[PDB]
């Protein structure tokens, strides 16, 4: 268990993803 679980989040806000590519695949702009 490592490398960012985004399942634990209900959704991931695009605001905290920076330039991370995998974060920008699940993130949601508000």
């Amino acid at each position, epitope marked *: 268990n*490592n490398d960012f*679980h985004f399942e*634990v*989040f209900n959704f991931v*806000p695009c*605001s905290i993803c*920076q*330039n*991370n590519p995998t974060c920008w695949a699940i993130c949601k702009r508000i």
Partner: antibody
Amino acid sequence: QLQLQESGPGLVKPSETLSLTCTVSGGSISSSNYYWGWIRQPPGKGLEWIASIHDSGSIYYNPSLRSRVTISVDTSKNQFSLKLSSVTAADTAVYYCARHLVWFGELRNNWFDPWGQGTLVTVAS
Amino acid sequence: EIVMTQSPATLSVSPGERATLSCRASQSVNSNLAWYQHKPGQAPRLLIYGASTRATGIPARFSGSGSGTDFTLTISSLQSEDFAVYYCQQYNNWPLFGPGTKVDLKR
């Protein structure tokens, strides 16, 4: 300077729900890219994180408590609250509220700075 | 599942010497590791994040080193003020804290 203050019942009957509120002062919760969370420490056990909430309504959950946690933010009164359902003696603890810095950029941030002073909850029949 | 262990559970230290403290992970956490100081009855305080980075307002006598599975927090020139429990916390996937080490003073 940023300060957090928990307030909530010292005593909650088992099989019921425990609710706490953090009142942040010396800084505004909205708008802010910080999550706001609750950590608890049972007597003579380690620290366990519970849940955090972001101004946007995103919620970061510790999976082993998700099913029992409801966490909310009242951006106007500068207050986030925690509700933990169906409590047992396993829930007796000091509950801290904290500012949760989450970031997935070049150097991750996923820590708690600063913290409140804790409030003791007791789950007693 | 990541497991944070710390050693020694407790440590007695002469006023002035250097207390070196250890945190260990089951799997690797890169450098996603922070250290907190918790004096009794007071609020926890973030000492180090990044596993090498002092948080603002923290004396230079506190330093963090290590990576992957082995980290060490060290307090050079220990003061009596410093008596407390120190927890590490990994954040490779989500917040997990170590059991903590109690730092006692000798006199």
